[PDB]
Design a binder for this molecule. Structure first.
Ligand SMILES: *[C@@H](CS(C)(=O)=O)[C@H](Cc1ccc(CN)cc1)NC(=O)[C@H](COC)NC(=O)[C@H](CC(C)C)NC(=O)c1cnc(C)s1
Ligand SMILES: *[C@@H](CS(C)(=O)=O)[C@H](Cc1ccc(CN)cc1)NC(=O)[C@H](COC)NC(=O)[C@H](CC(C)C)NC(=O)c1cnc(C)s1
Ligand SMILES: [Mg+2]
Ligand SMILES: [Mg+2]
Ligand SMILES: [Mg+2]
Ligand SMILES: [Mg+2]
Lengths: 195, 196, 226, 204, 233, 212, 222, 195, 196
């Protein structure tokens, strides 16, 4: 899977993820959602090797959903990201490692703060104001370095994201067929249907 | 390495040089390659020093435990235990062992165990890198039922030539004589054997 | 390939099978592996068929010009020396293995030549994938002072051993007899032990069986003229 | 990777009573992709016919080369080249590129104008001549063609019977090869008339 | 997976009217070194079977012990061990063939080619081949290594098909085997002059011949051969 | 190999070719690349012939066990996921598979799932899989609409395989057609390309590149 | 490095008639350019009116046939001496072959017999167990030589009714056992001429409701 | 260079060639013309290895322009294509071959016929009604097989070409940034500026 | 291959086996490895047959042309021409040549030219694959100024052992005697030398 972006603004986290699924010669699908809801206020986008991506995402989803039922309580985004990191860090020394990079965007209901975690397939975790995986960051980080402010609104965050996607559509060789955008805030997770 | 075991009238004699090399550096110039697995069953080691020492130590253990239960083992029995280890672990070993021993019933016997782990009973045996240079000499000069003094001279002359031509061989010529009389160690220095 | 050569009382004889192969398929069932060099000098070839053919033809051409220049019958040693020096130059890349035999003023001769440029002298020789089958026969039966009748028998037997027992070799047996003071006799299809048996059916089709889209006449002549 | 099987295609030639036949498929491809269904592989220089399978750039190059050489031959000799002589010219020209060869499988077919004798020949890529009495095969379905020819063929077929035999040999061989087919052409050659027929075959 | 170290060369054999002949030289080679000159590679099993083995000698010595152990095991609780329940050539072969194929299938082969020659209970000739791959085949003549290339062509001139077996006597068959062993000594660089030969006959039983030598060798023609082409002296 | 399946107003069309190859050798022209799992489920086969047959036959057994245990027809989603989870266990071992699981259930409606041997599982409206997929896609995407007649949709699927059978060296033989509805799948015949091609050429006026 | 596979050559041929089936194979066994045997049977009667051949690497072929014969034996024990139908045999063979998917049996397998309606049946397998029922199938070294011929002569491919322009195909017919054996013999004679690994002898096993019959024919020994 | 298409209709040849120039990570240009006018009624489009493409095209252009001045005469499209084929066929056995595939579209003023030649880097020449190089043909030939007729107008040829480009934009993974289209007819060569 | 040249009182003797192998197949069992580059200058060839024949043919040409201009060349001169070819083309040659010759001034001389293209003048020389097995034997048994009969026995016994142990060596033992008296060819068959 190709491009996954994340940006943490004042009161929300915004995850943008490409729609293309390419198997070699042909583009098999142009509407693929590269994300799973782990809990009501925590969303994980993912990209990497075919099969491994979805298998890993759904495996994480099942474990967090199991935790939620057992304790009747939602884990913090920090806790979920640490769980995910450990699973990837365990994976890298396995017989066959998961080749999956993830972004975890969550709203911590205790602290009333949005949180964005970037974790690569090795289990390298970092909390960031904005993040990306693969070649996306090469184009988009210079923009985000320039335009980002911590006190941005969600609408300003989306405009800044449009500028990232336009730059990617101009300069990347692969046609990633646009992005599905999702916002994570105090009210939960919703999809921006027009982007 | 140049090693050999030779049967004769009164028993058997094992002979060896004393050079151990790591490439072209002589790591040990006074090595003892004649090693005891039982009172009157000895062996000559060639190949990986680690492997032949590891094997010889295990054989010595097996023959010690054999002796506690069933009395003195035959030279054939010793050669079989060597073979069993060498054959079954042929993929992980580089060992070329000559087994020599004295019974009163069987007298002197010599068994050679090359790389594959096969066994060959012989009147005499030669092995190691330096042996290639003395196949011709040893074949022409060996006789059966030699005396002790003749067999010592046969081994001394043989290993002298092996040492002369093989860089991997050298140092002192050690020998171990196995007869009814007991176990005798002999040593021969460069100034003696080089002028032969 | 099974090629062989052996000497007899007042001559030398060459033998060869007639199969050419491409991997596991038979390209040719009747090929001539006994190449012509001079009227009384012949060459059996194995290895790469194009190479064996080309090298014998080239040396044969140069031997003819040499013979014209010197006004002498060509010698087998001249063909031998020219072949080996050529083959050596190319370092085995011309993959030709040859048995050269002939008669000249010096006498009768028999040599073998390898692709890398080495030569041998012998009283009986064989080359190719069937050499071991042939040599087994030659080692069992060859003796000194063979008659011509015994020599043709032994040569053809050696080639047959290859034909039956070697997959590389097959079909017919070619022979060439070079005897002192006589014309060399070249005997193509000397034996024919592998004729195909009659087929069970005839697969000749009813006319019009094949569907045709178009027809036209091809103009092969020069200028249809006014 | 193997140059002789990038483009694909086949040629077969047969002898009959006072006649020869040479035939070829029409496919040119880039491995799996079919590109052209009009790529003829049989050419003629006077009354001598040459089929060529293998790498298509060399098929075209050699056609142009033998046209060149046979044109000069004719100007100097003051007669058209004969099949036996042309066979030797093909062999020569192939072998002179021994260590950088044309990746082709040529097939000569024709009737000697003086003796009236039917003649066919085949070559490997470096010029070794196979001069068959019965038939010659070449191309990516050469194994298939060997099987068809070896069972279907019988000697001394009349021109219109020989047409049926060679056509069925080509068509059924081509249908068992992925890289051959897409149409086919058959030349029936007699001493002073040549008929060319395009065959209807499955287009996959 | 290994590589063969000490090796034995050709084993050759053929059927004749009343039985089978098998032969093999007494050499154990160590690459190009002709190391061991007293190695017996024909191993009899009872009085009706001989197993001839080529290839790796350490793996041969293992197989030799398996066959020795097989005879012991057959005798256990078997009052007819020396009669109707004695080991047959076909039993001995099928056992070996099972072992050879199992070992190749674990990627750890016994690096040998084996010919089991014998005579069955009903007088039928038994002759079958098996190798390190578990490949098996039977034929009126069988040979391993260089024997396949040189001996078989000579032996097939005597017995070319099944119908030639009743027409071939033991004298003609042995002669053919002895000639084949000479040819192999001329032409196989890893062979020796000394060999062993075994005849298993349905009437006269097992005859095992040791310390045979290749004789009547033609070398005299060598004196006249001079240089490699143009040399006259 | 060219397999395709697409969703439309009147259900699902499934069309496949019939050729099997070993390199450039045409092993067979009469191969079945559609597996009938039950009256409402189909499976297409691309990639390794044995891998597809074995595991899609096995899939049918697992789908039968589901309905014995749950007294209910297996969902297309569940059936596709049994196969995708299986192949994922074998990932890296060298299985070669491209497949579509096509069926109707009341809860899902008509559904198509693409599953392959590197573990990918995708739901979608149109899929083409195999060496001739690009050729099938060309024809299919151009004439695809949601609201074709069942007769027109069947023709398009047939025609798309024909297009691929022509151009792709490794595709051919014959076209097998299926139509999946509320009531189940219906076979719409085996159509030999050596007859279909010429029929289509004349009636449609296409294939002008060919000498006809 | 040790190579566990080899190639013993040979060629086999199955043809399904109306109320019979044949499975033919040459009797030559080879390695490289040497003949191992001129008569080594390759086609076997497996019981229950089924004949089988696994051509390619002979050790894997023998192993597979041995295992299938044993599978028939245990099918009788486990299911009250029930006759193993040819379709059931075929599926059983798929599982034998696929069981070694990652260390395959290096063989092309063909079985022949009669289906449960008494009609002739041939089944054909790749080395890892993919199979199809066919009217016609050659396997092994000369399969490329033989199969186009069978397409033409058994299934009447590329053959049209004369005078119909090319619009009525030659209609499909079942062949008599005598006609099939003529096509089998000519296939192998042809294959022997042009393939170096084919020759020596031809053994044909014919399966009818009455049982399994054998026929043997000489082939060229070069 | 990626996609080059060609289609010969009733009275003209239409060449469409992608605008993208990608060097690895980035798209350096989105308006590149992958064509040279060889003569007034002969146009050559090209695609292949970087540098070699333009070097070869301009080398051919110079030779044909030299011929035109020397003889005061335009070579036929057939003659130009044979010249080009020979240069590529010479190239393939060189020290370093030209890795260039071309399409030559021309209007033969003698015969009053459009002509389209497809030549690959090996020197494999074919005259076609429609052609493509690289992966383009995998998508586009099935369309052209379906929709092409020899008596099509230039406007119908352009509509058929739009359908090819739409299919390529849907199913190809690379963003080739649209195509420059050029028409070759009796009046010469002109560019369709809106496509 | 087993080859050797031995100087003695009256001149020099060259000796060789007659076996040529392609792997384990004996391509020629009656090879003549003693080859004439001049009347009384001969050489023993080992290594690539093609290479040593190609070299020997060139040397013979050079010494023939030397003789036409400057009279009889020395054995040293012949060894130098061999060396020049072997050394300058060392990257493309596998040749191990022993050069032996008789002058009246210098008497018997032996020069060995191993793979590198170096020259070494020696009292005697051994070479080829089978020589490894007789270094010991030859060193112990060689004396200077032997008679003709002693030198023939020394070579016969030596090559007998080389043949016995080396598979690459075998067949007949050919010898060439070089003295003031002339050039004598000798041959010795297996039935003679094997029983030594
Ligand atoms: C037997 C040689 S063997 C098996 O190596 O012992 C014959 C000898 C031979 C000599 C001369 C002629 C004709 N004047 C024919 C045959 N050689 C062959 O069968 C060789 C293959 O041996 C390895 N055949 C060829 O070389 C063939 C050409 C014939 C079919 C006409 N060519 C090739 O196979 C190829 C050449 N280059 C390739 C790439 S493939
Ligand atoms: C086409 C797939 S492709 C390469 O994308 O064009 C077909 C699809 C297919 C699906 C189902 C069946 C049911 N029997 C058949 C075919 N696949 C094949 O043709 C594959 C292609 O190679 C991967 N062919 C094979 O799997 C062949 C089948 C034999 C019947 C020829 N087997 C092999 O190639 C093997 C080679 N070595 C083996 C061990 S298996
Ligand atoms: Mg086809
Ligand atoms: Mg096709
Ligand atoms: Mg044959
Ligand atoms: Mg020897």
């Amino acid at each position: 899977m190709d491009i996954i972006l994340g940006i943490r603004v004042q009161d929300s986290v915004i995850l943008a993820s490409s729609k293309a699924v390419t198997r070699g010669i042909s583009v098999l699908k142009d509407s693929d959602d590269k994300t799973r809801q782990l809990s009501p206020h925590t969303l994980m986008s993912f990209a990497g090797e075919a099969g491994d991506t979805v298998q890993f995402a759904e495996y994480i989803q099942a474990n967090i959903q199991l935790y939620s039922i057992r304790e009747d309580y939602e884990l913090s985004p920090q806790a979920v990201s640490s769980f995910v990191r450990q699973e990837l860090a365990k994976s890298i020394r396995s017989r066959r490692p998961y080749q999956v990079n993830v972004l975890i965007g969550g709203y911590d209901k205790k602290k009333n703060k949005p949180e964005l975690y970037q974790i690569d397939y090795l289990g390298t975790k970092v909390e960031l104001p904005y993040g990306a995986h693969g070649y996306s960051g090469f184009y988009t980080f210079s923009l985000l370095d320039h335009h980002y402010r911590p006190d941005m609104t969600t609408e300003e965050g989306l405009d800044l994201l449009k500028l990232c996607v336009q730059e990617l559509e101009k300069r990347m060789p692969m046609d990633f067929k646009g992005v599905i955008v999702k916002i994570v805030d105090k009210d939960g997770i919703r999809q921006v249907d027009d982007f | 390495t140049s090693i050999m075991a030779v049967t004769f009238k009164d028993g058997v004699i094992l002979g060896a040089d004393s050079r151990t090399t790591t490439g072209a550096y002589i790591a040990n110039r006074v090595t003892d390659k004649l090693t005891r697995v039982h009172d009157k069953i000895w062996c000559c080691r060639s190949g990986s020093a680690a492997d032949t020492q590891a094997i010889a130590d295990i054989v010595q253990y097996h023959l010690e435990l054999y002796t506690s239960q069933y009395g003195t083992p035959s030279t054939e029995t010793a050669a079989s235990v060597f073979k069993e280890l060498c054959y079954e672990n042929k993929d992980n070993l580089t060992a070329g062992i000559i087994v020599a021993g004295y019974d009163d019933k069987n007298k002197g016997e010599v068994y050679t165990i090359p790389l594959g782990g096969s066994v060959h009973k012989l009147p005499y045996a030669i092995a190691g890198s330096g042996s290639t240079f003395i196949y011709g000499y040893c074949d022409k000069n060996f006789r059966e039922n030699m005396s002790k003094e003749e067999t010592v001279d046969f081994i001394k002359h043989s290993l002298s030539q092996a040492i002369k031509w093989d860089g991997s061989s050298g140092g002192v010529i050690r020998m171990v004589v196995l007869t009814a009389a007991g176990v005798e160690r002999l040593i021969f220095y460069p100034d003696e054997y080089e002028q032969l | 390939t099974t090629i062989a050569g052996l000497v007899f009382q007042d001559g030398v004889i060459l033998g060869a099978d007639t199969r050419a192969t491409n991997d596991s398929v038979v390209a040719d069932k009747s090929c001539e592996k006994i190449h012509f060099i001079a009227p009384k000098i012949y060459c059996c070839g194995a290895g790469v068929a194009a190479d064996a053919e080309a090298v014998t033809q080239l040396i044969g051409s140069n031997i003819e010009l040499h013979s014209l220049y010197t006004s002498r019958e060509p010698r087998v040693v001249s063909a031998l020396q020219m072949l080996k020096q050529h083959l050596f130059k190319y370092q085995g890349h011309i993959g030709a293995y040859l048995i050269v035999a002939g008669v000249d003023p010096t006498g009768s001769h028999l040599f073998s030549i390898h692709a890398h440029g080495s030569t041998d002298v012998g009283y009986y020789l064989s080359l190719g994938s069937g050499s071991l089958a042939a040599m087994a026969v030659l080692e069992s039966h060859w003796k000194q002072d063979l008659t011509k009748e015994e020599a043709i028998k032994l040569a053809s037997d050696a080639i047959q051993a290859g034909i039956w027992n070697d997959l590389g070799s097959g079909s017919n047996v070619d022979v060439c007899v070079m005897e002192i003071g006589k014309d060399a006799e070249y005997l193509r299809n000397y034996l024919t032990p592998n004729v195909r048996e009659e087929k069970q059916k005839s697969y000749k089709f009813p006319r019009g069986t094949t569907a045709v889209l178009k027809e036209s006449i091809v103009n092969i002549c020069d200028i249809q003229e006014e | 990777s193997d140059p002789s099987s990038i483009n694909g295609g086949i040629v077969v030639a047969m002898t009959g009573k006072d006649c020869v036949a040479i035939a070829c498929d029409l496919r040119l491809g880039s491995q799996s992709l079919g590109v052209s269904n009009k790529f003829e592989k049989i050419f003629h220089y006077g009354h001598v016919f040459l089929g060529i399978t293998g790498l298509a750039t060399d098929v075209t190059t050699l056609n142009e080369m033998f046209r060149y050489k046979t044109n000069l031959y004719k100007l100097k000799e003051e007669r058209a080249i004969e099949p036996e002589t042309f066979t030797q010219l093909v062999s020569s020209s192939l072998y002179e590129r021994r260590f950088g060869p044309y990746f082709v499988g040529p097939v000569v077919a024709g009737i000697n104008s003086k003796s009236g004798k039917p003649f066919i020949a085949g070559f490997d890529l470096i010029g070794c001549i196979d001069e068959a009495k019965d038939f010659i095969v070449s191309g990516t379905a050469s194994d298939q063609l060997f099987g068809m020819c070896e069972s279907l063929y019988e000697p001394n077929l009349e021109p219109e019977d020989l047409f049926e035999t060679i056509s069925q040999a080509l068509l059924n061989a081509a249908d068992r090869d992925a890289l051959s087919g897409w149409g086919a052409v058959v030349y029936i050659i007699k001493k002073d008339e040549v008929v060319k027929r395009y065959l209807k075959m499955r287009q996959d | 997976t290994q590589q063969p170290i000490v090796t034995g060369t050709s084993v050759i054999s053929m059927k004749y009217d009343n039985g089978v002949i098998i032969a093999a030289d007494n050499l154990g080679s160590y690459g190009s070194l002709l190391r061991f000159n007293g190695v017996e590679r024909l191993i009899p099993v009872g009085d009706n079977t001989v197993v001839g083995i080529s290839g790796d000698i350490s793996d041969m010595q293992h197989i030799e012990r398996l066959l020795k152990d097989l005879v012991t095991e057959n005798a256990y609780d078997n009052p007819l061990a020396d009669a109707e329940e004695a080991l047959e050539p076909s039993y001995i072969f099928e056992y070996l063939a099972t072992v050879m194929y199992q070992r190749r299938s674990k990627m750890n082969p016994l690096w040998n080619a084996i010919i089991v020659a014998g005579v069955q209970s009903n007088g039928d000739q038994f002759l079958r081949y098996v190798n390190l791959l578990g490949v098996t085949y039977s034929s009126p003549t069988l040979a391993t290594g260089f024997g396949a290339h040189m001996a078989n062509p000579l032996l097939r001139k005597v017995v070319d098909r099944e119908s030639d077996i009743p027409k071939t006597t033991v004298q003609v068959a042995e002669e053919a085997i002895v000639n084949a062993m000479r040819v192999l000594y001329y032409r196989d660089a890893r062979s020796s002059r000394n060999f062993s030969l075994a005849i298993i006959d349905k009437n006269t039983g097992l005859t095992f011949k040791k310390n045979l030598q290749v004789e009547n060798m033609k070398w005299d023609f060598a004196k006249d051969i001079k240089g490699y082409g143009t040399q006259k002296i | 190999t060219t397999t395709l399946a697409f969703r439309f107003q009147g259900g699902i069309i499934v069309a496949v070719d019939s050729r099997a190859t070993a390199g450039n050798w045409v092993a067979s022209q009469t191969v079945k690349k559609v597996i009938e799992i039950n009256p409402f489920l189909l499976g297409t086969m691309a990639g390794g012939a044995a891998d597809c047959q074995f595991w899609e036959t096995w899939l049918g057994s697992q789908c039968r066990l589901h309905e014995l245990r749950e007294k209910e027809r297996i969902s297309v989603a569940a059936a596709s996921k049994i196969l995708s989870n299986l192949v994922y266990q074998y990932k890296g071992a060298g299985l070669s598979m491209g497949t579509m699981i096509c069926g109707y259930t009341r809860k899902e409606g008509p559904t198509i799932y693409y599953v392959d041997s590197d573990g990918t599982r995708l739901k979608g409206d149109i899929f083409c899989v195999g060496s001739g997929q690009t050729f099938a896609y060309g024809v299919l995407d151009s004439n695809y609409k949601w609201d074709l007649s069942v007769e027109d949709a069947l023709y398009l699927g047939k025609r798309s395989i024909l297009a691929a059978a022509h151009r792709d060296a490794y595709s051919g033989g014959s076209v097998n057609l299926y139509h999946v509805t509320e009531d189940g799948w219906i076979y719409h015949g085996n159509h030999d390309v050596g007859e279909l091609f010429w029929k289509v050429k004349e009636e449609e006026g296409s294939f002008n590149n060919v000498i006809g | 490095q040790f190579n566990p596979y080899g190639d013993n050559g040979g060629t086999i041929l199955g043809i399904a008639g109306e109320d019979f089936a044949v499975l033919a194979g040459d009797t030559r066994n080879i390695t490289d350019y040497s003949i191992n045997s001129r008569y080594e049977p390759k086609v076997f009667d497996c019981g229950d009116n089924i004949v089988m051949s696994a051509n390619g690497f002979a050790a894997d072929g023998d192993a597979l046939v041995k295992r299938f014969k044993n599978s028939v034996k245990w099918y009788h024990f486990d299911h009250n001496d029930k006759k193993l139908s040819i379709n059931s045999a075929a599926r059983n063979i798929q599982h034998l072959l696929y069981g070694k998917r990652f260390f395959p049996y290096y063989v092309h397998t063909i079985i022949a017999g009669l289906d449960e309606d008494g009609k002739g049946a041939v089944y054909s397998f790749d080395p890892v167990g993919s199979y199809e029922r066919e009217q016609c199938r050659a396997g092994g070294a000369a399969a490329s030589l033989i199969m186009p011929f069978l397409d033409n002569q058994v299934n009447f491919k590329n053959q049209y009714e004369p005078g119909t322009n090319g619009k009525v195909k030659k209609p499909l017919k079942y062949l008599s056992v005598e006609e099939v054996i003529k096509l089998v013999r000519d296939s192998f004679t042809s294959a022997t001429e042009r393939h170096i690994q084919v020759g020596d002898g031809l053994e044909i096993l014919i399966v009818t409701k009455d049982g399994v019959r054998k026929e043997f024919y000489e082939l060229k020994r070069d």
